[PDB]
Structures are given as C-alpha cells and as structure tokens.
Design a protein around this ligand. Structure first.
Ligand SMILES: Cc1ncc(C[n+]2c([C@H](O)CC(C)C)sc(CCOP(=O)(O)OP(=O)(O)O)c2C)c(N)n1
Ligand SMILES: Cc1ncc(C[n+]2c([C@H](O)CC(C)C)sc(CCOP(=O)(O)OP(=O)(O)O)c2C)c(N)n1
Ligand SMILES: [Cl-]
Ligand SMILES: [Cl-]
Ligand SMILES: [Cl-]
Ligand SMILES: [Cl-]
Ligand SMILES: [K+]
Ligand SMILES: [K+]
Ligand SMILES: [K+]
Ligand SMILES: [K+]
Ligand SMILES: [Mn+2]
Ligand SMILES: [Mn+2]
Lengths: 388, 335, 335, 388
C-alpha cells in the first residue's frame, strides 16, 4: 500500500492518464420543462401559492425596472446600467431557498436577490442616481447595491474579490455558532480569477458553511466559454477542491430553489461548502457600454415564461391578473423613478467621510480646501443639483 | 468636459484609440513574433483599440485570454522570456492590481536577478487609465505612482493621438518591460493628424509644449490639457508667462528637462488626477527641491486628486480641474 | 551588524518576536472574536511570533491557511466584515504583493464605497519587513511606499519591543484595516523591558526620541537606530545637535510633529532602506518643503536604498548605513 | 436536450450532488518495487546501462553536494541552503525524459535537473557563494540557480509565479513550431497560489505544449497537506481544467521517467498540457532556517536506495564501484567547494547593472555616489573580499 501523506490511493502498475469528461459533462438538474410542467413528482417542492406568486412578481418587477433604467441610461439620465435579462430565475429561486438573515455576497447581476428580499424601488433607484437617499452616498457607479438590513454586502466592481471574503464571513459565522450560511454569487468569467481558486480551497480546508453560486450564462462580455475554460464548466472544478457540486437549469426557478435549499441545509449542518453552477443565457447586452451584436433563449427558454406557464397550470394566474399586474408594476416603478429624479445629490462634503472611520486631520484639511474653493469658484460647479 | 483637446510622411486624422490600433498594426506588420492578448481583445476590445487586427494577422496572434489578470501578465512574461514580443492588455488600469506581484516581483526583476541570462524586455502591458466622468472607484484610477517605486519597469502615459502612437511604438520596441497607460477619456475626444507609417518618440524625455518664464507647470495624460488651459488663464488674467511641460515617462523620468525649466522660472506647480499622498508629484517635487534649491522662489505646489477613492457622483468636485490649478498658481505667484 | 539597539505595571525583558506574541496573547485574551491565521502560524510561525497561542486559545482561533496570500487577505476581510477581529499574517512583506488587489481595491475602500453600511475595520495584517543581512530580493523588502498611496488603510512600523507591542495593540483595536510591518532583523536582536499587561501607543503620532537644534533626522523601523547613531557621530565629530524622530505611522502620518521640528532646526534628513524613487521620503520631503519653505536653510536630504532590487552579496553596499547618512548630513550642514 | 453554451451535458430529473473521491484517489503509478524489482515487464522502459548509471550518479552527486553545502551553511560560510533529500528521483527521472533543449521552469528544489544536464559543480557553488564566477552576479540568495545554455530559467523565490510564465513560453514555442515542450515544476504548497489556477486554465484554453510537474512531498514548511487542500491532491484538479493528469510514485525513477516521457511526446504532438503529480516525502528540513522536528522514508522508501537495488540486479554496480564512486564524488565536490571559497565576490558596481538593459542616467548617478562614498569611507566596508 502507498504510504504518501499527500493522497489516499492504491498503486497502479500501468501508465494511464486521467481524461476529463467534457463531452459528457455533469448533467443539468431540471424540475420543470419549458412549458412549466413538473417532470418528476418526487422533485416537486410544492411551494405554496403566495410564495410562487412572490417568485413571479419579483422577477417581473425586476424586469420592469430593468427596462426603465436601461432607457434612462440611453437618455443620459443615469451614467450606467446593467440588466438581468434571462437570469431572473437564478436570483429569485436561490434567494427564496435562503433564510432571511443568510449573508449574501454578489457580483453585479443579482439584483433579483435584493428584490426578493423587499429592497425598496426607491433605494435601487437612489443608488443608480446617486441621490440623497442613497445610503452608499452616491460614491459608487450604478447597480453597486448593498443593504445592511437585508444582509446583502455592497457590490464592488473587481471581479471575484468577494469569493474569499464570503469564505471568511462563513468561517466567522461557524465560530459564532450562527445557524447561518453565506452565499457567494459570481459569473463564469469571474471564476477564472485567482481569487476563485483561493476561496474554493479555503472553504474546503477551513470547513466553512458557504454556498458558491456560479451563474454560467455563456459569455463574459464578448468572450464565449470556449475561450474561458476547457474543462466541464465550473461545476466540474468543485470535486477537485473536495467541494460537493451540482449543475442546475438556471432557467428553472424550482431546480434552482431545490438545489439551493438542500445546499443550505447541508452546508449549515455539516460546515462544508457546496457549489451550484446555474446554466443560463445572458439575454441582454453585457451592460449599457456594450453592443452585444458585435460578437454573437428569449422566446423558447426564458425563466419568466416558464414560471408563468406553471402558475396557469395550478390556476394561480390568468390574463386579467397579468394585465393588472403589468400596469401596477409599471406604476410602482414609474413612481420611484420620478421621485428618484427629483431628489438632489448629496452634499459634496460626503466625498471625504468614511475613507477611514474617523476623518484624519490631513483629510479634513482637503475638505476645508474644497469648501474654500467653492466659495470663490462655485459658479463653475454644478452646485444647484447638490444638497446644502 | 473638464478639458479641451487642441516630418513623418503621409498622415491621417486619428482619435486616440485609432492611433493605438495604428501602432499595434505597424508593430505586428514588422515583427512576426508579436502577439496581442487579454480580455475581449479578439472582437476589437471594449474601447475598439484592436479592431481589425485579428482578421489581418490571425487568431494565433490576436486572441482572448481567460479572465485573470495575474495569468495575463505571467503569460506575457513567459512569451517575452522566449524573445517574442508580447503585447498584453489589462482591461482598465483599476484591474491591474491582481497582476501587481507578477509585475513588481517578476517582470521588473527578471533581468537583474538572472544576471541578464534571462529577460522579459519584449513585454508591454497597455491599459486604459484615468478619469472618464462617471467611472467611479474602479473605472477611473491612475495607478502610476504605485509602479514608480519599482526599479526595472518603465511607465509611459501619452497626452494625444500623435504622442500615443510614437510612445507606444517606443514601449513595444524598448528592451525593458513597459506599462503604457492610455487616457481613456481621450479615446474618442482627442483627434489629430497621425503618421500612417511607424515612428518613435523617445522614452524618459519630457516635452516642453509651451515656453514660459514665470512658472513651470508639469503634468501628464489628460491633465496636460488642463494645465495648457491654466497657462492661458494665467496669461490673460494675471500677465503670468507659464512654461508647460508634458512629462510623458513616469519612470525613468526626465529630471534634467524639469530642473532646467525650474532653474529658469523659479516656480513649479505639478498636477495629477491621482491622490496627493504618495502620488508621483511628491517624487518630482522632492527632487526639484534638492536640485533647484537656490532657484526656487516659492514652495512647489502639487494640485492633485484628494486622498480618497475616486467617487461617482462627486467626480466634478474631486478632480484637480483648471480652477483648482489656477487658484493654486495664483497663490504661488503671490508668494 | 549595521545597527546597534539601545508607568505601565510589571515588565519583563522581551525581544521583538516575544513582544509581538505578548500583544497577540493580550488581544486574544480580551477579545473572544479574535483569530490569527496565515502560513505556518499554528506551530508558532517561522519567526516564532505565535508560539504557544494555539495551545492556549484553540485550533479554531490560531490556524494555518493554504498557501495563498490573496486568499489570506480576502479571508481576513470577510471575517472583519462580520465584526470579528482578524489578525492575518503574511509570511514576509515581499510576498504581500499577490494580495495587493485585496488590500488596495477592497480592504482600503470597503467602508467608503458602502457609505459605512459595511467595513473591515477589525482586520490587521502583520508581516516581517526590512533587510536581514542576506535576505536578497525576496526576504528583504520594505514595501510601505506602495501602500502609502492608498487612502483607507493605515501602515505602521515599530522600532523596538516596547514600541511593537503598544503599536500592534493599537492597530488590532483601530477601527480601520491596518498593515503592521515587523522589522525582522530586530526579532531576536532588540530586547528591553515590556509591560506584561496591554497598553497602547497612538497611531499617526511620530516620537521625538532625542531633542536637537541643528538638524532634524527622520526614519522608521531599524533605520531609527541608524540615525540615532548618526546623531551621536554628528555630535562628536561636528559639534552638530540632531533631533531624532521615529515616524512610526507611515499613513496617516504625523505631519505636525515633523514640521514643528524643522521649523526649529531649519534642516531635514530623511532615511529609509526602501529605494529612493517613489519611496516615502519623497512624500515627507515635498510636504515639509510646502509647510516650512521660509525655515528651510538647506535642501532636504533623502538617504535611501538605491533604485535597484535588494541584492544578496552586495547588501553591505546597498543599505543607507550610518556612514552614508553621516556623509549626507555633513554635506547638508556645510550647505 | 440542454442547449446551454457553457457545458455539454444531458438533463437529470433528480437532485444529486457530485461527491469527490478522496479516500479512493487517483492511483499511484509504480514501475519498480522498493527492492528495485520491475513489477510489470510491459512497463519497463529498458533504459540502457550508461543512462541508468547517469541517473544514479547524478542523484548521489547531488546528495554529496547537499551534505557539504548544508554543512557550509551551518558554519556560516554561505548564508542559506535547501537540500533535495528524498526527491532526487523526481528530478533525474523527469529530466532524463526531456529533450536537452526543452525549457525548464522551477521552484527551488529541482537542482537534480541541472545536475542531470551537466551543470558544473563550480557554478552551483558560485551561485551559493555569490562569487565572481556566478553568472547571476551574486544578486540572489543561494540555490536560486539559472543556466541559459541548459535551458533552465532562473529560479525566483515567489511561489508559483513561474507557472503562468511557463505557459506563455509554451505558447511562444507552439507558434515558433519548436518541437519543444516546456516543463514547470512546483510543490503542493505552491499549487495553492492563484497563479497555479491561472497557469492551468491558460494552458488548456490556449492549447500549450507544457508539462506541469507537481512534487507532492507532504509538507509546505510546517503545514501538512491536510491543511493545504481537501480534494484528492493536485492530480485530481487537472481534469477540471481539461488537463490530462496522472499520479506517480516520485520515489521510483522509472515511473517518473515513463510518465514524463509519454507526457512530453503527447504534449508536443497535440499541443495540450499534461499534469504529473509525483508523490514523495521531504526527508530534509524545509531549509537551513527550519528545524523540522518542531512539527513532525529515509530507510524504507528512498529513490536512491531503490535505484541502487535495480543496478545490482542487472549486475551493473557492486560494493567496490559504490566505494570508488563515493570517494570520487566526494573529491569532485570538495575540489569545487575549495575553489568556490577562494574566489572573490564580484565588483560592487554590479549592484547597479541589469536593472534595465541599459543603465538610466539617474541610476549611474547612484553608482557614482557609491564609488565616491567608498573612496572616502572604504575602510568601513568589506572591500578586500570583492573584485576590483
Ligand atoms: C478584475 C477585473 N477584471 C476585469 C473586469 C472588467 N469586467 C467587468 C466590469 O468592469 C464590471 C463593472 C462594469 C461592474 S464585467 C466583466 C465580464 C465578467 O463576466 P462574468 O461571466 O463573470 O459575468 P457576467 O456574464 O454576468 O457579466 C469584465 C471583464 C472587472 N470588473 N474586474
Ligand atoms: C508567495 C510566497 N509566499 C510564501 C513564501 C514563503 N515560502 C518559501 C520561501 O520563501 C522559499 C525561499 C526561501 C526560496 S518556501 C514555502 C513552502 C513551499 O512549500 P511547497 O510544498 O510548495 O514546496 P516544498 O515542500 O518543496 O518546499 C513558503 C511558504 C514564498 N516563497 N512565496
Ligand atoms: Cl468653466
Ligand atoms: Cl469607461
Ligand atoms: Cl529571514
Ligand atoms: Cl564602522
Ligand atoms: K467584487
Ligand atoms: K518592452
Ligand atoms: K484594525
Ligand atoms: K518562482
Ligand atoms: Mn458570464
Ligand atoms: Mn511541499
């Protein structure tokens, strides 16, 4: 028997390289077909009516907001925007399987998680406009959301940096004896970053109650997955780190829900990481800075459509309700939009606070310098737009 | 806009992104070893800097990498170790940090530590840089002072399309690893005549773009246009003659040109979008004070970004614009 | 050796590594959330800084991570986001670079960018630092100037066992992410009385360790001992009275204490082992010149490492030793 | 059928997490037993006598040098040293399977590769002493070897940085139409670094003729593999990146040789990366700065012993030859040692060259400053030891 400390294995007396299974990859877990029918009764979560209607209304409200804010960016009213088209099912399915206080780390294309957690329209819009209601104080670009009340850690632009952070937060939770899980969302492009290898390995070796949730939507800006990796997606990397792994149909709210629910239950009980790779397709442009027709679902495999067919089959929705909700959600979004546009931006003084908890004397000096500057040269600045 | 943009055979009107493409095209045409790679470069890049190059030169020479900056730079170093020209792209300068170890511990030290048995001199890293009106914390940064403390690399920042193509070609051909920062606000805004055929502008050489006798103003990138305007404001409002200098190369920098100017004028104002503390203006100011002590009539002024992260909604208040520069100059003239 | 090393209840003789252990022990005893982690910390660390702590406090609180600095820092940030005290170790400062993105883009910006909804104030990163006689390129580095250009972190470097324990405890308790650099040459060499119980030395406060009237000398870490000796050489050989200052905190630094001293003496010499160009002496020198222009009798001198990587066999020629400092001081006195 | 661009897979209609096989890991390829007997005739490479004797003499000459230089460090004659005890088989087995011009990148514990490539004793010692014969000009700490003539890229201390570099050199070789492979050695600790994830993924997606060679010797300084990772060693990560992977008995020169020979042949022909994880045990301390009894093969499973038993079975070695060689190798090592000690160190001027190819004027100024300094204060410096 082999005695080596680094692995537990038998000897083999013939030379055989291990080949990857890429053509026959890890199968894709599905619960409902594209016509919203349950495929296998034993997999049906039987979520109650009110909950399924909340999944549905959260996706469509996000979609309504996406359309309006994308238009607002085109018109130059906000500086930037990124839509969530095609991926709404991954957000709501997974968020619904979490406990309300489970801590979420994200990437930027997970706003449905906040919407499911009842984040006000007013605050989504406050961040995008950088207005006085923004608790982020207008400091980050649009869609960089965060909510301490709803346990959603502020998004930052550098890709995959939240992965090892999420793991540290999960270790701390273990120690605290939390019965809390951390979930960490990221795209398949971000998974190429060195921070992903760090987070996956730390989570396994330090035994952390974390769910890694990878949204595999086929592209990282212009780059197709054929140029991103050569193994069988992200799900096939999990086992190499000792992480329990699964791949799901990301357009199937119930498949996402079931996988996330079981991962949460087991990650918290066993202090072990789980990896979920949700297969989807990025229907929108990458962002408002991107015209995606430069380098490359909507009608035949959309999470919202599939969920709508399911509601109809239970008798839980109809055309009349769909019309009334389309109207109500438009009105709700337009009300927040109009309010967001009429609010002033924050005091320019806020440019200097929170750099450190306290303000260093030399930083206060710079703040004073700006105040003096604006007293003399204020006509040359957009002052009438900013509070105070 | 906080700024206004104002021999070598046939020329064409080119904006800054087009001049970059022209430099790259000229490089690949004349150097069969040269390759260009990074995130999204194959379809022409997120700022169009590589449009048409893959079609012209082939998918083995202009290609996308996986999304991993430390991989991008380590990969380019290894190409350059074989002697092949490696032109790496980092999508925004803000995202150069994951590669900081490969740049500082590896690329910068490669020739020294091997006694010149190996080198990565044929590596160039290009990256969009500087503010853009709404880039906020991670699409706005100017990281040149981080790199200035690293012996063994060169750091170069152009102010215009003509300067960009001649400086980029010099970086590509220079026998040391170079970081070329492209001021992204200028990609479409700045446009002027640029020679179609290749030409070089020397590295480690500042350019006096306007002679003056009362004060020396030094900047680089977009900020050169800000100080050019400041010189005009100072002439009109104060009857003050400003010598305006574009530093161009951050390291090794042109100490002689700057000191020669300050010996003549007796006053120096340096401006950059990067934060004040630890910013590269501190290196210039210390050195000038050491070399021009007897000539300096007033303290050297640095007009820089505040010591904060780069904000979204507050950008108009954050940047060292023409009024901040002018006011500082006014005070220094009054000294 | 290029240097010689020279109220609060009961004290014990402690060398620098022992004073670090004492600080850590005091921290874990009083803060049940605190944990210490990094490469090889469990058996007591490669410099013995964590000996006995895992036995005392448990394997969940003092533990080894996999070999990945970017993971170490990202992990510590995430612990600190929950409010728990995270004391990360980076095995040598030379190997902090892979974590540069997590430090600069993440830790430093965490509070600002979330409008204080989230922070990592309870993170401290400790790392051995500075020359060691034969460390060569990657066991010798002093990276503080790279970090000085990053608003949002604090950077702290002690000169002795007593200073190390009081400064480390301040870093651990400070509500901002802190990098604490431990001068590794001093781990065994420097030994003095250190209070057994916890006490704090304030951050962003320089210490005048010897009053003088003719010149101000500023350094930090081991180099404080070099300048103390230089002050003695200057007194004996030149009849020159030197005011010797330990800066202690690199950022935010104690501008007032330094300027107050230079207003009195009229001359300043700053010394550090890090390379000259882009080194933190350039920030101090620029600022002092801006604030003390009318008082400065001579150009400010910087006596630093050369602009090269840190060599193996040439170390005795590379460092800004007492003779290089003295000679520079002599010349500045002659000015 | 699933239509997702990110993976090629079937649907599955039941929720099943993929579990890692860690207890039953990838088996360990062996050719000869611990008594030097061939286990499976069809795997015997039948290397000719002269070659096997070169494998043997290279290992023992390295071992002789290791003992002397380790003693030299203890006495303070050189500043630092790291031995290769227990791992000599991985070095020579793999180096013998390479073409002479295949480019090698390493970590620090691969000196046998240089020894196999006939790197002079004088130059190993010149580097450790930093003397005038060192082509590295005394600039790096001991054991940081490099040889342009023998295609061995200069070692650097930062772990795993050579991994993505090796991949770039391999891409360049492909382009050049080289019929050349690159090999990249690293330890199991270094494999935890983000640069390893970068290199593995780039090699697969960019299709590079590279062999990744991981020496898994059970510890990274004090850290056992149980704290380094939780999956099945490094070999199990390869397939996740699409890399053909194998695990070998690193104490078996012939197993290492066979795996390396076949990987080289296929990597060059197919432009595809191969990963070899060689299981060994670090017999020595980590380095001269380490006392390994603080946190934890020699007699029952040593590569040198095993190879010696093999030679005896063919009738290719005997006690007399062993004694004569023990003496000859001691003399060769002691001659180089004495020469290395009598050489001066290089001119202190060399502190300034090769920072850039040319010397910047401001750097020349610093060099002049030192020259002036030494003219005045030279008595205070160890000048009598340095050339010129
Ligand atoms: C370290 C690093 N490198 C590159 C990028 C650039 N980039 C982006 C932005 O800058 C995002 C801001 C606008 C919020 S997004 C992006 C593509 C990421 O693709 P993924 O597949 O991970 O995610 P998705 O398909 O959901 O957009 C890149 C290359 C980045 N943000 N961080
Ligand atoms: C990025 C980084 N982090 C930490 C280290 C420190 N370290 C080392 C040195 O500094 C090496 C020099 C003396 C040559 S070696 C080392 C252990 C590496 O263990 P591996 O299993 O990869 O290799 P091996 O078992 O063969 O020593 C570490 C933590 C390092 N060199 N680089
Ligand atoms: Cl105006
Ligand atoms: Cl932009
Ligand atoms: Cl050391
Ligand atoms: Cl002396
Ligand atoms: K992030
Ligand atoms: K170059
Ligand atoms: K702290
Ligand atoms: K290395
Ligand atoms: Mn994607
Ligand atoms: Mn090891």
């Amino acid at each position: 028997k082999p005695q080596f400390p680094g692995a537990s294995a038998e000897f083999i007396d013939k030379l055989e390289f291990i080949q990857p299974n890429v053509i026959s990859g890890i199968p894709i877990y599905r619960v409902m077909d594209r016509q919203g029918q349950i495929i296998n009764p034993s997999e049906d979560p039987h979520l109650p009516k009110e909950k399924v209607l909340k999944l549905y209304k959260s996706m469509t409200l996000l979609n309504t907001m996406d359309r309006i804010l994308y238009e607002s960016q085109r018109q130059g009213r906000i500086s930037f925007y990124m839509t969530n088209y095609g991926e709404e099912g991954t957000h709501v399915g997974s968020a619904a399987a979490l406990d309300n206080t489970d801590l979420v780390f994200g990437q930027y294309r997970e706003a449905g998680v906040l919407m499911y957690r009842d984040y006000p329209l007013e605050l989504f819009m406050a961040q995008c406009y950088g207005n006085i209601s923004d608790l982020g104080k207008g400091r980050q670009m649009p869609v960089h959301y965060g909510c301490k009340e709803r346990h959603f850690v502020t998004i930052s632009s550098p890709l995959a940096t939240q992965i090892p952070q999420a793991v540290g937060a999960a270790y701390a939770a273990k120690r605290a004896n939390a019965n809390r899980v951390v979930i960490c969302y990221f795209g398949e492009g971000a998974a190429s970053e060195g921070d992903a290898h760090a987070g996956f390995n730390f989570a396994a070796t330090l035994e952390c109650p974390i769910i890694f949730f990878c949204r595999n939507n086929g592209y990282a800006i212009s780059t197709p997955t054929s140029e991103q990796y050569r193994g069988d997606g992200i799900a096939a990397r999990g086992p190499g780190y000792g992480i329990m792994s699964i791949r799901v149909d990301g357009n199937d709210v119930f498949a996402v829900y079931n996988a996330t629910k079981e991962a949460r239950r087991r990650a918290v009980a066993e202090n072990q990481p789980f990896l979920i790779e949700a297969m989807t397709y990025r229907i929108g442009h990458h962002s408002t800075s991107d015209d995606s027709s430069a380098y490359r679902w909507d009608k035949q495999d959309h999470p919202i459509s599939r969920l709508r067919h399911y509601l109809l089959s239970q008798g839980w929705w109809d055309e009349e309700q769909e019309k009334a909700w389309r109207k109500q959600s438009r009105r709700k979004v337009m009300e927040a939009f109009e309010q967001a546009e009429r609010k002033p931006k924050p005091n320019p003084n806020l440019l200097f606070s929170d750099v450190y908890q306290e303000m260093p004397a030399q930083l206060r000096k710079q703040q004073e310098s700006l105040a003096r500057h604006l007293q003399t040269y204020g006509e040359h600045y957009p002052l009438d737009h900013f509070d105070k | 806009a906080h700024f206004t943009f104002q021999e070598y055979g046939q020329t064409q009107k080119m904006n800054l992104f087009q001049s970059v493409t022209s430099a790259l095209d000229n490089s690949l045409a004349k150097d069969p070893t040269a390759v260009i790679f990074g995130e999204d470069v194959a379809f022409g890049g997120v700022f169009r800097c590589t449009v048409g190059l893959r079609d012209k030169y082939g998918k083995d020479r202009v290609f996308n990498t996986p999304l991993c900056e430390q991989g991008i730079v380590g990969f380019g170093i290894g190409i350059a170790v074989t002697g092949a020209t490696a032109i790496a792209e980092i999508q925004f300068a803000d995202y150069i940090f994951p590669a900081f170890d490969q740049i500082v511990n590896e690329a910068a030290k490669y020739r020294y530590r091997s006694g010149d048995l190996f080198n990565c001199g044929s590596l160039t890293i290009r990256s969009p840089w500087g503010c853009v009106g709404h880039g906020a914390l991670y699409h706005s940064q100017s990281p040149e002072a981080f790199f200035a403390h690293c012996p063994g690399i060169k750091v170069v920042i152009p102010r215009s399309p003509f300067q960009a193509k001649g400086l980029l070609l010099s970086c590509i051909e220079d026998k040391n690893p170079c970081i070329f920062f492209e001021p992204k606000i200028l990609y479409r805004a700045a446009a002027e005549e640029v020679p179609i055929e290749p030409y070089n502008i020397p590295l480690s050489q500042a350019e006096v773009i306007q002679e003056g006798s009362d004060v020396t103003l030094v900047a680089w990138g977009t900020q050169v246009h800000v100080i050019r305007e400041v010189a005009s404001m100072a002439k009109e409002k104060l009857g003050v003659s400003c010598e305006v200098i574009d530093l161009r190369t951050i390291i090794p920098w042109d100490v002689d040109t700057i000191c020669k100017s300050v010996i003549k004028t007796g006053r120096l104002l340096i401006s950059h979008e990067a934060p004040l503390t630890g910013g590269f203006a501190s290196e210039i100011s210390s050195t000038v004070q050491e070399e021009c002590f007897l000539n300096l009539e007033a303290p050297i002024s640095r007009v820089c970004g505040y010591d904060t992260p780069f904000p979204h909604i507050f950008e108009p208040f954050y940047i060292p614009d023409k009024w901040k520069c002018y006011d500082a100059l006014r005070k220094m003239i009054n000294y």
